[PDB]
Write an enzyme that holds these catalytic residues in place. Sequence first.
Site, PDB file in Angstrom:
ATOM      1  N   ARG A   1     -16.367  -2.582  -3.120  1.00 36.04           N
ATOM      2  CA  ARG A   1     -15.140  -1.801  -3.279  1.00 36.04           C
ATOM      3  C   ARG A   1     -14.090  -2.488  -4.159  1.00 36.04           C
ATOM      4  O   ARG A   1     -13.368  -1.821  -4.902  1.00 36.04           O
ATOM      5  CB  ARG A   1     -14.558  -1.359  -1.933  1.00 36.04           C
ATOM      6  CG  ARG A   1     -13.421  -0.348  -2.108  1.00 36.04           C
ATOM      7  CD  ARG A   1     -13.131   0.429  -0.838  1.00 36.04           C
ATOM      8  NE  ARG A   1     -12.658  -0.436   0.250  1.00 36.04           N
ATOM      9  CZ  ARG A   1     -13.378  -0.767   1.320  1.00 36.04           C
ATOM     10  NH1 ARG A   1     -14.617  -0.319   1.461  1.00 36.04           N
ATOM     11  NH2 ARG A   1     -12.851  -1.546   2.261  1.00 36.04           N
TER      12      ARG A   1
ATOM     13  N   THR B   1     -12.612 -14.580  -2.638  1.00 30.60           N
ATOM     14  CA  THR B   1     -13.543 -13.448  -2.513  1.00 30.60           C
ATOM     15  C   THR B   1     -13.650 -12.916  -1.075  1.00 30.60           C
ATOM     16  O   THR B   1     -14.702 -13.025  -0.421  1.00 30.60           O
ATOM     17  CB  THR B   1     -14.957 -13.805  -3.041  1.00 30.60           C
ATOM     18  OG1 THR B   1     -15.475 -14.923  -2.309  1.00 30.60           O
ATOM     19  CG2 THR B   1     -14.919 -14.145  -4.527  1.00 30.60           C
TER      20      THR B   1
ATOM     21  N   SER C   1     -15.185  -8.355   9.883  1.00 30.18           N
ATOM     22  CA  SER C   1     -14.348  -7.971  11.018  1.00 30.18           C
ATOM     23  C   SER C   1     -15.026  -6.939  11.918  1.00 30.18           C
ATOM     24  O   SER C   1     -14.502  -6.596  12.979  1.00 30.18           O
ATOM     25  CB  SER C   1     -13.004  -7.428  10.522  1.00 30.18           C
ATOM     26  OG  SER C   1     -12.301  -8.413   9.784  1.00 30.18           O
TER      27      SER C   1
ATOM     28  N   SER D   1     -14.660  -3.140   6.702  1.00 30.23           N
ATOM     29  CA  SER D   1     -14.557  -4.599   6.681  1.00 30.23           C
ATOM     30  C   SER D   1     -15.728  -5.196   7.457  1.00 30.23           C
ATOM     31  O   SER D   1     -15.728  -5.207   8.689  1.00 30.23           O
ATOM     32  CB  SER D   1     -13.215  -5.057   7.261  1.00 30.23           C
ATOM     33  OG  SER D   1     -13.030  -6.451   7.064  1.00 30.23           O
TER      34      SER D   1
ATOM     35  N   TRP E   1     -12.110  -0.825  -7.215  1.00 28.14           N
ATOM     36  CA  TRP E   1     -10.659  -0.772  -7.405  1.00 28.14           C
ATOM     37  C   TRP E   1     -10.297  -1.117  -8.851  1.00 28.14           C
ATOM     38  O   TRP E   1      -9.376  -0.537  -9.412  1.00 28.14           O
ATOM     39  CB  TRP E   1      -9.921  -1.731  -6.468  1.00 28.14           C
ATOM     40  CG  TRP E   1      -9.934  -1.387  -4.992  1.00 28.14           C
ATOM     41  CD1 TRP E   1     -10.125  -2.267  -3.961  1.00 28.14           C
ATOM     42  CD2 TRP E   1      -9.722  -0.095  -4.382  1.00 28.14           C
ATOM     43  NE1 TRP E   1     -10.055  -1.611  -2.755  1.00 28.14           N
ATOM     44  CE2 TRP E   1      -9.810  -0.280  -2.981  1.00 28.14           C
ATOM     45  CE3 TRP E   1      -9.482   1.195  -4.880  1.00 28.14           C
ATOM     46  CZ2 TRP E   1      -9.660   0.779  -2.065  1.00 28.14           C
ATOM     47  CZ3 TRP E   1      -9.327   2.254  -3.966  1.00 28.14           C
ATOM     48  CH2 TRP E   1      -9.422   2.035  -2.574  1.00 28.14           C
TER      49      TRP E   1
ATOM     50  N   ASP F   1       0.796  -1.237   0.000  1.00 21.98           N
ATOM     51  CA  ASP F   1       0.000   0.000   0.000  1.00 21.98           C
ATOM     52  C   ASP F   1       0.831   1.290   0.000  1.00 21.98           C
ATOM     53  O   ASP F   1       0.364   2.342   0.459  1.00 21.98           O
ATOM     54  CB  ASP F   1      -1.025  -0.015   1.145  1.00 21.98           C
ATOM     55  CG  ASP F   1      -2.116  -1.049   0.935  1.00 21.98           C
ATOM     56  OD1 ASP F   1      -2.626  -1.173  -0.198  1.00 21.98           O
ATOM     57  OD2 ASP F   1      -2.473  -1.738   1.914  1.00 21.98           O
TER      58      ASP F   1
ATOM     59  N   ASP G   1      -6.562  -4.209  -4.914  1.00 24.17           N
ATOM     60  CA  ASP G   1      -6.278  -2.791  -4.651  1.00 24.17           C
ATOM     61  C   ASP G   1      -4.852  -2.388  -5.040  1.00 24.17           C
ATOM     62  O   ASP G   1      -4.539  -1.199  -5.138  1.00 24.17           O
ATOM     63  CB  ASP G   1      -6.632  -2.390  -3.209  1.00 24.17           C
ATOM     64  CG  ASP G   1      -5.700  -2.984  -2.166  1.00 24.17           C
ATOM     65  OD1 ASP G   1      -5.837  -2.585  -0.993  1.00 24.17           O
ATOM     66  OD2 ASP G   1      -4.835  -3.833  -2.480  1.00 24.17           O
TER      67      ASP G   1
ATOM     68  N   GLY H   1      -8.475 -17.784  -6.939  1.00 23.74           N
ATOM     69  CA  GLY H   1      -8.931 -16.503  -6.414  1.00 23.74           C
ATOM     70  C   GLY H   1      -9.763 -16.701  -5.160  1.00 23.74           C
ATOM     71  O   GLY H   1     -10.418 -17.735  -4.999  1.00 23.74           O
TER      72      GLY H   1
END
Length: 397
Positions: free
Chosen positions: A246, A234, A367, A364, A250, A114, A174, A232
């Site tokens: 989101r 998800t 979470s 999130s 991205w 990031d 992202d 992959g």
Amino acid sequence: MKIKPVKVESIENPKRFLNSRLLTKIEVEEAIEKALKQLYINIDYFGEEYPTPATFNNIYKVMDNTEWTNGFWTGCLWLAYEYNQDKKLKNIAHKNVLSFLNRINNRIALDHHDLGFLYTPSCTAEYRINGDVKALEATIKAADKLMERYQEKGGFIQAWGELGYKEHYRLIIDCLLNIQLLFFAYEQTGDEKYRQVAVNHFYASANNVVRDDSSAFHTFYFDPETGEPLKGVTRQGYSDESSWARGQAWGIYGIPLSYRKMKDYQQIILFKGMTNYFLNRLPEDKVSYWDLIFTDGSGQPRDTSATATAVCGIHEMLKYLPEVDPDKETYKYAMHTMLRSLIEQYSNNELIAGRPLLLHGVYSWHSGKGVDEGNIWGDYYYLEALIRFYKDWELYW
């Protein structure tokens, strides 16, 4: 490099966008001014420190420079500074820049991908605006930091975790926003390695983290021995069968940003696929629910940050999309409708310390982090959308 075919959904019932009123200068101006009133209140609230990633009961907490989100705060300040040329904004934003320079010099909390989110809207932003050499220095050092996570086997920038380790050997969607930092480093230095990593990472993402139906995985794993794509995942969405909003956004923004630097028409087609998918799953007010499986009546929270990000992406792609593209006008009206809804229904009206610019995001869900809360990237992309519409904006990205 070939990109696999993706299903390009037609924009279903396009009058839902085309029948809308385009945003006027005064409407956007007033939205910008309301946002700036909140930003000025928050400069005093945060001081030289930073908002937390998300709000708590719509009030940010205050934190140091150790998250993935700190650059979005500085980005809000620079955007505001472009709007009103207030030296006070530059003063605080440049102090943030010096903090970012300290952070990279001392390699504090930067073992992740990031670096672009952190350094682009803060340091590269200042460099665009006034050519500050310390802002440039921090940017290049950040680019080198990001390059450290590149994996030759698979040709991607590895997400946070143990480098090279199979159970962590993955990219996250992202990262499409974070390779812009590498394209910048290429342009500044002439060092092809920056561009090679960005391009390789782009195609690794496009061919894998984007699905055949134009939906998006969050994460995609590779084999550390062979470099072969594996599977992959998800993550962050409601269920295995759902569509995290989101993540889709991205893609919608990351694709045109990379297209600037790559000019591969396959990217325009990939954009059309991902954007039409997103548009088709928007509810009545055109603001994405946090997961695209939900629409009106679901009682689920929105994620306005996904919609803000998608607006920026559509705005960007429209700079390049051929006039003969039968959906170009639909996209223009779509981004106006979406931004109008953000301004009129989701933007902050209560001007008190710690409030966000934009309400009703989801950080999130599983979470329980920033669920139906403002968040700093949503604030940033909302203001970026406003500034995009208002002026000929020179991208930080």
